[PDB]
C-alpha cells in the first residue's frame, strides 16, 4: 500500500569511479606471506601475528601458510607453561582451525579451591585472550563456561583505568567477540586500532588498507549490477506492498562471503535474498489466505505456466522469481554445475510452504499448541535456503555430495537455524504469533524467564557450531564457513529501518574508502 523505497536512493546504482598502488599491493602480499612462514621471536609472537593477519581481513591470501604454522604450534608445545595470554590465544586460533585442544590447558590457572587465581585478575591482556577463547568452547567444558562470566566481570571493571588502544580493544570485545563477528565488519574496525598499537607491523597494515579498498571496489561493481537488475524489475510501481531491501540483502550476502573468488556467488545469492524478501512481503501483505494458497501452489509446481494460475498482482514476483533461478542455471552451466540449482530451488519452495502456515495462523488468529508451533517455527528462518544457495556459486570444493548432506539437514545448518530463529524471537518480543509469548503461556513464566531459556539455546547452538569445526568434519571448511557466517550475521545484525548496525556496516564497507 506504500511500496519501497531504499533509504540509499540511487547512491549505489552507477558503476564506481592507480597502477602504482596495485604493484605495491602485489609486492606487499608476498612480503606478508614471507613473514608468516619466517620465524618470529617466539610462538606467542607468531600466534599474535597470525591473529592480526586474520583480524585485518587478509588471511584469505595466506590459507596454507597460516595452516602450516598452526600445525607446527599444535604438535610442538610446552603447556607447562605458557602465559594465560599465550595459552588462550593458542587455544582460540587452533580450535578455530579445528585442532582438538583440551580445555584442560586452563586448569593450571585455578587454585586448589577451584577458583581462578588472584594473579589472573591483574592480567588484563590475559583476561582479554581468555574472554575471546571462551567463545570457542563446546559442550562439557565448564571451565570456559566459568571463564566467560569471570572475564566479562573483571574486564568491565578494568576499562576505566586502561590506556589506548588496549582500552578500546576491551570495550569492543565486550560488545562483540571475534568468533561471532563478521570478518569484514571486524576487519574495518581492527584496521583503526591496529595503527595505534606501537609495534604493529607497518607492511601488514598498508597491505590490509589497500586490500580493503580493492575489495570495496569489487563489491561496489557487483552491487551496481544488482541495483540495475532490481531497477528494471520496477517493483516500485508494480508492487505497492513490497519493501526495497536490496542493499541490506547484499550486505547480508557479503557476510556469507566477501572474498573475490565468491563474486558470482554474491551476485546470485543477492538476487535470491531480494526475491525471497519480496515473496515474504507478499505473505505479510493484505493478501488473503485464499490468494496465498494458489501462490504457494504455483511456487511448489515452479513453471512459467503457473503464472496464469495466480492473482494478477502476484504475477510480477512469480515471473521475477523464476527468472532468477533460470539465470543461475545459465551462469553456472559453463562448468556443468546446473545440478546445484535444483537444490536451491527446493529450499526456496520449503520456505514458501512455511510462510503459508505462518500466514494462516495470523490471518485466522489460530493459537497453536506448543509442539504445533514448535514443529513449524524453524523452517521460516531461511538459513538453510541461504547456505544451500551459497554453495551454488562456489568452486569444485562443492560437490553433488555437499548438496545431499545439506538437504539431509546437517548439524551445522541446524545450529545456525536455532541461532537465527531464537535470536529473532527474543528480539521481536523485547525490542502476531510470538514464540516468546507462546513459551510464557506453555510453561507459565515471564518474558525475562523466556528470554533466559531462549538465549541459553542460542549459546548451546553456538557450542554445536564450534563442535562442527573440530576434526574430523562432515564437510570441507569453506562449506562449513557459510553456516558460521550466517550465524555471525545474526549476532551482528539481530540483537537490539534499517538498523544502526546495517546502516553502519553498509557505510563502512561500501561507502567510505580508507585513506592511504
> Which DSSP symbol is given to 440?
H
Cα–Cα dist 333/327, whole Å: 10
CB 338 within 8 A of CB 326: no
Distance, first Cα to last Cα, the chain: 47
Q: Which three-class secondary structure state does DSSP give residue 116? A: strand
Cell 585455578 locates to: 110
Cα–Cα dist 238/426, whole Å: 34
Other CB atoms within a 10 A radius of the CB of residue 5 amount to 10
| Experimental determination technique | X-ray
Cα–Cα dist 427/429, whole Å: 5
CA angle, 97 as apex, 102 and 78 as ends, to 5°? 45
Q: Which of 457, 487, 460, 483 is nearest to 137 (CA)?
A: 460
DSSP 42-84: SHHHHHHHHHHHHHTT-GGG-HHHHHHHHHHHHHS---TT--H
CA count, 13 A, side-chain hemisphere, 102: 5
Q: Which three-class secondary structure state does DSSP give residue 110? A: strand
Cell 571493571 locates to: 157
- In CATH terms, the superfamily for domain 40-199 is Terpene synthase, N-terminal domain (1.50.10.130)
Domain boundaries, given as residue ranges, for the chain: 1-39+200-515, 40-199
- Dig out the grid coordinates for 72 from the structure: 607446527
Cα–Cα dist 188/98, whole Å: 26
116: which strand partners? 110
Q: Which three-class secondary structure state does DSSP give residue 395? A: coil
CB 370 within 8 A of CB 442: yes
CA count, 13 A, side-chain hemisphere, 360: 13
Burial of 457 (0-12, 13-18, 19+ CB in 10 A): middle
- The alpha carbon of 309 is separated from its chain's Cα centroid by a whole number of angstroms, namely 38
Q: Which of 10, 53, 21, 16 is nearest to 34 (CA)?
A: 53
Q: What is the largest CA-CA distance in the chain?
A: 75
Establish whether 280 is an annotated binding residue. yes
Alpha helix segments (H runs only) across 364-429: 370-377, 383-392, 400-407, 411-429
CA count, 13 A, side-chain hemisphere, 44: 13
Q: Which of 347, 281, 265, 276 is nearest to 313 (CA)?
A: 281
Non-local CB neighbours of 464 within 8 Å, separated by 6+ positions: 138, 139, 411, 412, 414, 415
Other CB atoms within a 10 A radius of the CB of residue 225 amount to 12
What 3 state SS string does 253-278 have?
HHHHCCCHHHHHHHHHHHHHHHHHHH
DSSP 356-382: HHHHHHHHTT----HHHHHHHHGGGS-
Cα–Cα dist 269/261, whole Å: 14
CA angle, 144 as apex, 120 and 161 as ends, to 5°? 35
- Dig out the grid coordinates for 402 from the structure: 555437499
Non-local CB neighbours of 509 within 8 Å, separated by 6+ positions: 184, 185, 188, 216, 219, 251, 254
Other CB atoms within a 10 A radius of the CB of residue 438 amount to 20
Other CB atoms within a 10 A radius of the CB of residue 491 amount to 18
Other CB atoms within a 10 A radius of the CB of residue 234 amount to 10
What 3 state SS string does 311-330 have?
CHHHHHHHHHHHHHHHHHHH
Non-local CB neighbours of 2 within 8 Å, separated by 6+ positions: 240
Number of residues written out for the chain: 516
- Residue numbers followed by a gap, the chain, C–N over 2.5 Å: 17, 431, 496
Work out the angle between the directed axes of helices 383-392 and 400-407 (0-180°, nearest 10): 180
CB 427 within 8 A of CB 496: yes
- Dig out the grid coordinates for 114 from the structure: 577451584
Helix (H) / strand (E) containing 132 = helix 124-134
Cα–Cα dist 126/111, whole Å: 17
Q: String of b and e for 66-94 (b: at least 16 CB within 10 Å)?
A: beebbeebbeebeeeebebbbbbbbbbbb
DSSP 444-495: T--HHHHHHHHHHHHHHHHHHHHHHHSSS-SS-HHHHHHHHHHHHHHHHHS-
Other CB atoms within a 10 A radius of the CB of residue 344 amount to 24
Non-local CB neighbours of 100 within 8 Å, separated by 6+ positions: 470, 471
CATH class of 1-39+200-515: mainly alpha
Establish whether 308 is an annotated binding residue. no
DSSP 161-217: TPPTTHHHHHHHHHH--TTTS-HHHHHHHHHHHHHSSTT--HHHHHHHHHHHHHHHH
Cα–Cα dist 268/393, whole Å: 7
The answer to whether domain 1-39+200-515 and domain 40-199 are alike in fold is no
Establish whether 424 is an annotated binding residue. yes
- The alpha carbon of 180 is separated from its chain's Cα centroid by a whole number of angstroms, namely 8
Establish whether 428 is an annotated binding residue. yes
Cα–Cα dist 273/252, whole Å: 9
CB 317 within 8 A of CB 299: no
Amino acid at each position: 500500500a506504500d511500496f519501497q523505497p531504499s533509504i540509499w536512493g540511487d547512491l549505489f546504482l552507477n558503476c564506481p569511479d592507480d597502477a602504482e598502488t596495485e604493484k605495491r599491493h602485489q609486492q606487499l602480499k608476498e612480503e606478508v606471506r614471507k613473514m608468516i612462514v619466517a620465524p618470529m621471536a617466539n610462538s606467542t609472537q607468531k600466534l599474535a601475528f597470525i591473529d592480526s593477519v586474520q583480524r585485518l581481513g587478509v588471511s584469505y591470501h595466506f590459507t596454507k601458510e597460516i595452516e602450516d604454522e598452526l600445525e607446527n604450534i599444535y604438535h610442538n608445545n610446552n603447556d607447562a607453561e605458557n602465559d594465560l595470554y599465550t595459552t588462550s590465544i593458542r587455544f582460540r586460533l587452533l580450535r578455530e582451525h579445528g585442532y582438538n585442544v583440551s580445555c584442560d590447558v586452563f586448569n593450571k590457572f585455578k587454585d586448589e579451591q577451584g577458583n581462578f587465581k588472584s594473579s589472573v585478575t591483574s592480567d588484563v591482556r590475559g583476561l582479554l585472550e581468555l574472554y575471546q577463547a571462551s567463545y570457542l568452547r563446546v559442550h562439557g567444558e565448564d571451565i570456559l563456561d566459568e571463564a566467560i562470566s569471570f572475564t566479562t566481570h573483571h574486564l568491565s571493571l578494568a576499562v576505566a583505568s586502561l590506556d589506548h588502544p588496549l582500552s578500546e580493544e576491551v570495550s569492543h570485545a565486550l560488545k562483540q567477540s571475534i568468533r561471532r563477528g563478521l570478518p569484514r565488519v571486524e576487519a574495518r574496525h581492527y584496521l583503526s586500532v591496529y595503527q595505534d598499537i606501537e609495534s604493529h607491523n607497518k607492511a601488514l597494515l598498508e597491505f590490509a588498507k589497500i586490500d580493503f579498498n580493492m575489495l570495496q571496489f569489487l563489491h561496489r561493481k557487483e552491487l551496481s549490477e544488482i541495483c540495475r537488475w532490481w531497477k528494471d524489475l520496477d517493483f516500485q510501481r508494480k508492487l505497492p506492498y513490497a519493501r526495497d531491501r536490496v542493499v541490506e540483502g547484499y550486505f547480508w550476502i557479503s557476510g556469507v562471503y566477501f572474498e573475490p573468488q565468491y563474486s558470482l556467488g554474491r551476485k546470485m545469492l543477492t538476487k535470491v535474498i531480494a526475491m525471497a524478501s519480496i515473496v515474504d512481503d507478499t505473505y505479510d501483505s493484505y493478501a488473503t489466505y485464499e490468494e496465498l494458497i494458489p501462490y504457494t501452489n504455483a511456487i511448489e509446481r515452479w513453471d512459467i505456466k503457473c503464472i496464469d494460475e495466480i492473482p494478477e498482482y502476484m504475477k510480477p514476483s512469480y515471473k521475477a522469481l523464476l527468472d532468477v533461478y533460470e539465470e543461475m542455471v545459465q551462469l553456472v552451466a559453463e562448468h556443468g554445475r546446473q545440478y546445484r540449482v535444483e537444490y536451491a530451488k527446493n529450499a526456496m519452495i520449503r520456505l514458501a510452504q512455511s510462510y503459508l502456515v505462518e500466514a494462516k495462523w495470523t490471518l485466522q488468529n489460530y493459537k497453536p499448541s506448543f509442539e504445533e508451533f514448535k514443529a513449524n517455527a524453524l523452517p521460516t528462518c531461511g538459513y538453510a535456503m541461504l547456505a544451500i544457495t551459497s554453495f551454488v556459486g562456489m568452486g569444485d570444493i562443492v560437490t553433488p555430495e555437499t548438496f545431499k548432506w545439506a538437504a539431509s539437514d546437517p548439524k551445522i545448518i541446524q545450529a545456525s537455524t536455532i541461532i537465527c530463529r531464537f535470536m529473532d524471537d527474543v528480539a521481536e518480543h523485547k525490542f502476531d504469533c510470538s514464540a516468546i509469548e507462546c513459551y510464557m503461556e506453555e510453561y507459565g513464566v515471564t518474558a525475562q524467564e523466556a528470554y533466559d531459556v531462549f538465549n541459553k539455546h542460542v549459546e548451546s547452538a553456538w557450542k554445536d557450531l564450534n563442535q562442527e569445526f573440530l576434526k574430523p568434519t562432515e564437510m570441507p571448511t569453506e562449506v562449513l564457513n557459510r553456516s558460521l557466517n550466517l550465524a555471525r550475521v545474526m549476532d551482528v545484525l539481530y540483537r537490539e529501518y534499517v538498523g544502526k548496525a546495517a546502516k553502519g556496516g553498509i557505510t563502512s564497507l561500501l561507502i567510505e574508502p580508507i585513506a592511504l
